[PDB]
Design an enzyme around this catalytic site. Structure first.
Site, short mmCIF file in Angstrom:
data_model
loop_
_atom_site.label_atom_id
_atom_site.label_comp_id
_atom_site.label_asym_id
_atom_site.label_seq_id
_atom_site.Cartn_x
_atom_site.Cartn_y
_atom_site.Cartn_z
N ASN A 201 -21.34 89.37 39.81
CA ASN A 201 -20.27 90.59 38.63
C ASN A 201 -20.55 89.68 37.18
O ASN A 201 -20.13 88.64 36.96
CB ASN A 201 -18.96 91.12 39.74
CG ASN A 201 -18.19 89.45 38.70
OD1 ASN A 201 -17.52 89.72 38.28
ND2 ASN A 201 -17.85 88.62 39.87
N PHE B 103 -13.54 90.30 32.02
CA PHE B 103 -12.28 90.40 31.85
C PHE B 103 -12.01 91.63 31.69
O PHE B 103 -10.60 92.17 30.45
CB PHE B 103 -11.31 89.11 30.90
CG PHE B 103 -11.36 87.73 31.60
CD1 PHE B 103 -10.68 87.08 30.89
CD2 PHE B 103 -10.83 87.52 32.97
CE1 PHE B 103 -11.59 85.42 31.86
CE2 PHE B 103 -10.76 86.65 33.39
CZ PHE B 103 -11.27 85.64 32.57
N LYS C 150 -7.19 77.86 38.36
CA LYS C 150 -8.45 78.12 39.38
C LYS C 150 -9.45 77.14 38.82
O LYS C 150 -10.23 77.17 37.38
CB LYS C 150 -8.48 79.47 39.27
CG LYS C 150 -9.94 80.16 40.10
CD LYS C 150 -9.32 81.59 40.13
CE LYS C 150 -10.79 82.25 41.40
NZ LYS C 150 -10.89 83.60 41.83
N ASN D 130 -17.86 84.55 32.69
CA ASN D 130 -18.49 85.96 32.59
C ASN D 130 -16.99 85.86 30.98
O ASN D 130 -17.48 87.31 30.04
CB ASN D 130 -18.29 87.20 33.27
CG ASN D 130 -18.69 87.02 34.12
OD1 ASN D 130 -19.82 86.33 33.90
ND2 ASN D 130 -17.70 87.44 35.51
N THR D 131 -17.07 84.67 30.17
CA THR D 131 -16.10 84.48 29.35
C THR D 131 -16.94 83.35 28.66
O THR D 131 -16.78 82.47 28.63
CB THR D 131 -14.89 84.82 29.39
OG1 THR D 131 -14.18 85.89 30.00
CG2 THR D 131 -14.07 84.54 28.18
N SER E 62 -13.83 81.68 34.98
CA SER E 62 -14.87 82.60 34.55
C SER E 62 -16.21 82.40 34.29
O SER E 62 -15.80 81.63 33.10
CB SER E 62 -13.54 83.11 33.51
OG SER E 62 -14.62 84.83 33.37
N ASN F 196 -14.34 79.08 41.47
CA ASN F 196 -14.05 80.88 41.08
C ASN F 196 -15.48 81.09 41.44
O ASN F 196 -16.10 80.74 42.48
CB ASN F 196 -13.73 80.73 39.78
CG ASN F 196 -13.57 82.07 39.43
OD1 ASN F 196 -14.28 83.51 39.64
ND2 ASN F 196 -13.00 82.84 38.21
C1 LIG Z 1 -16.06 92.04 41.14
C2 LIG Z 1 -15.41 91.22 41.90
C3 LIG Z 1 -14.62 90.32 40.45
C4 LIG Z 1 -14.11 89.10 40.44
N1 LIG Z 1 -13.22 89.29 39.39
C5 LIG Z 1 -11.95 87.47 39.03
C6 LIG Z 1 -11.21 87.39 38.28
O1 LIG Z 1 -11.03 88.88 37.11
N2 LIG Z 1 -10.30 86.41 38.51
C7 LIG Z 1 -10.46 85.17 38.46
O2 LIG Z 1 -9.26 84.92 38.88
N3 LIG Z 1 -11.60 86.22 39.75
C8 LIG Z 1 -11.89 86.55 40.20
N4 LIG Z 1 -13.03 87.01 40.87
C9 LIG Z 1 -14.05 85.66 41.93
C10 LIG Z 1 -13.02 85.71 43.19
O3 LIG Z 1 -10.97 85.67 43.38
C11 LIG Z 1 -13.13 84.44 44.17
O4 LIG Z 1 -13.08 83.12 43.46
C12 LIG Z 1 -14.47 84.37 44.45
O5 LIG Z 1 -15.47 86.04 44.48
C13 LIG Z 1 -15.24 84.21 45.71
O6 LIG Z 1 -14.16 84.30 46.92
P1 LIG Z 1 -14.69 85.88 47.76
O7 LIG Z 1 -16.20 84.99 48.12
O8 LIG Z 1 -14.16 86.00 48.76
O9 LIG Z 1 -15.38 86.88 47.29
C14 LIG Z 1 -14.14 88.19 40.93
C15 LIG Z 1 -14.34 88.62 42.33
C16 LIG Z 1 -15.82 89.62 42.55
C17 LIG Z 1 -16.67 89.81 43.19
O1 LIG Z 2 -13.86 89.87 35.63
C1 LIG Z 2 -14.31 88.59 35.48
O2 LIG Z 2 -16.27 88.85 35.42
C2 LIG Z 2 -14.45 87.77 36.35
C3 LIG Z 2 -13.83 86.46 36.25
C4 LIG Z 2 -13.73 85.62 37.17
O3 LIG Z 2 -12.59 84.68 37.23
N1 LIG Z 2 -14.24 85.90 38.09
C5 LIG Z 2 -15.74 86.55 38.20
O4 LIG Z 2 -16.70 86.38 38.59
N2 LIG Z 2 -15.88 87.64 37.32
#
Ligand SMILES: Cc1cc2nc3c(=O)[nH]c(=O)nc-3n(C[C@H](O)[C@H](O)[C@H](O)COP(=O)(O)O)c2cc1C
Ligand SMILES: O=C(O)c1cc(=O)[nH]c(=O)[nH]1
Ligand SMILES: NC(=O)c1cc(C(=O)O)cc(-c2ccc(-c3ccccc3)cc2)c1
Length: 361
Positions: A110, A114, A220, A182-183, A180, A249
């Site tokens: 992804n 943000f 994080k 993506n920023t 993140s 993350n």
């Molecule tokens: C579609 C998507 C959006 C995410 N958005 C955020 C976010 O806004 N902020 C954040 O701290 N982590 C974000 N994450 C990361 C998750 O909180 C987590 O750190 C990471 O995906 C690992 O866990 P998982 O493998 O169980 O998904 C996002 C992950 C995905 C897949």
């Molecule tokens: O909003 C996002 O793109 C985003 C934020 C983050 O902390 N981690 C991630 O995988 N996506």
């Protein structure tokens, strides 16, 4: 809920009709309304960060970015909820498509960027159920709020400071998201010098809040940190007294073996391919902080074994997201039941006893 029905029929069919983002939106809607398909035993209870958690399995940031389905997520079985990442001002994020499925790898990539309704909207949304949350927290169901920064912001530290003052009073814990991928330049804030300045301001703002509205502060971090970065983070964390860490993350790496057709899309990789990279980062941060800093483990958790491996590695709590996108709501109960069984099988009186167990063996 029937785990097999969702994993073999419902979810698969859904993924064949809607695109990732549309599916997500629908998911948030159904969840917020409580349209969902296991009783927590004392063994799963954990006390950390100045709070009690009926179970150590929470929903990771990203699923509920704007705090719209908190109650539905508790109903799903999560021991605690963390709402995506919120930025000071609203912003749309990157253009679509910005989320991709890698079914052959049980992973996701992804690059949302943000996308956030902003602090004001989220603030009013949480205030509308502030007292209800107060009772949930007292009942062992804490709420975490994850803070991000706007794309065009010039003062990153001020962006997080604002998040602390606006949402800090409504959260049990705050997350300074500096991982993140993506920023542009966000991850550079993980540097020792920048992180110290950033966290010093955050903590000062946090300490200025009235006691009952004073949340714990966690940072994080990414799973792509060098050994030096990790040593520095640990040092700053102990110097400033950070309350805890959220480990890894998503990853900008692309582990060899990925089969998904979309494996080369830009963005953060989540799911199974990230699991062990995440567990190992948790293991390292636990040791660097002498087990004195609470850690929330996140990354590729889809079963009781996955959760226990992170717990034994040093995590006091775990979170998941990607697994939910493949197996659906039933995955929460599955993880908890398997974790309970494994804890008994391995001679642990409870989750607390297993925290960091690998470091003592
Ligand atoms: C579609 C998507 C959006 C995410 N958005 C955020 C976010 O806004 N902020 C954040 O701290 N982590 C974000 N994450 C990361 C998750 O909180 C987590 O750190 C990471 O995906 C690992 O866990 P998982 O493998 O169980 O998904 C996002 C992950 C995905 C897949
Ligand atoms: O909003 C996002 O793109 C985003 C934020 C983050 O902390 N981690 C991630 O995988 N996506
Ligand atoms: N990115 C995502 O967040 C995401 C991606 C996908 C996908 O298929 O790619 C699917 C979901 C998803 C859809 C529906 C439900 C659900 C909720 C309540 C009751 C029954 C089902 C759970 C998760 C989320």
């Amino acid at each position: 809920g029937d785990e097999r029905f969702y994993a073999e029929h419902l979810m698969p069919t859904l993924q064949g009709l809607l695109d990732p983002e549309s599916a997500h939106r629908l998911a948030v809607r159904f969840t917020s309304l409580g349209l969902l398909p296991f009783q927590d035993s004392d063994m799963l209870e954990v006390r950390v960060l100045g709070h009690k958690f009926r179970n150590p399995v929470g929903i990771a940031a990203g699923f509920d970015k704007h705090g719209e389905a908190v109650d539905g997520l508790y109903k799903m079985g999560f021991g605690f909820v963390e709402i995506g990442s919120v930025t000071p001002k609203p912003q749309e994020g990157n253009p679509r498509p910005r989320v991709f499925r890698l079914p052959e790898d049980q992973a996701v990539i992804n690059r949302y960027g943000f996308n956030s309704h902003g602090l004001s909207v989220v603030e009013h949304r949480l205030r509308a159920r502030q007292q209800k949350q107060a009772k949930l927290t007292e009942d062992g169901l804490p709420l975490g709020v994850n803070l991000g920064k706007n794309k065009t912001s010039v003062d990153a530290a001020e962006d997080y400071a604002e998040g602390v003052r606006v949402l800090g009073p409504l959260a049990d814990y705050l997350v300074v998201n500096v991982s993140s991928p993506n920023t542009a330049g966000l991850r550079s804030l993980q540097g020792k010098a920048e992180l110290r300045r950033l966290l010093t301001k955050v903590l000062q703002e946090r300490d200025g809040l009235r006691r009952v509205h004073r949340p714990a502060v966690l940072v994080k971090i990414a799973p792509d940190l060098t050994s030096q970065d990790k040593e520095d983070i640990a040092s700053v964390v102990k110097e400033l007294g950070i309350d805890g860490l959220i480990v890894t993350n998503t990853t900008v790496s692309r582990p060899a073996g990925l089969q998904g057709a979309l494996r080369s899309e830009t963005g953060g990789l989540s799911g199974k391919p990230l699991r062990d990279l995440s567990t190992q980062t948790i293991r390292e941060m636990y040791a660097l902080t002498q087990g004195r800093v609470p850690i929330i483990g996140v990354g590729g958790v889809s079963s009781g074994q996955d959760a226990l491996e992170k717990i034994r590695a040093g995590a006091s709590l775990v979170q998941l997201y990607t697994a939910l996108t493949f197996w659906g709501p039933p995955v929460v109960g599955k993880v908890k039941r398997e974790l309970e069984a494994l804890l008994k099988e391995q001679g642990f009186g409870g989750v607390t006893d297993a925290i960091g167990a690998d470091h003592r063996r």
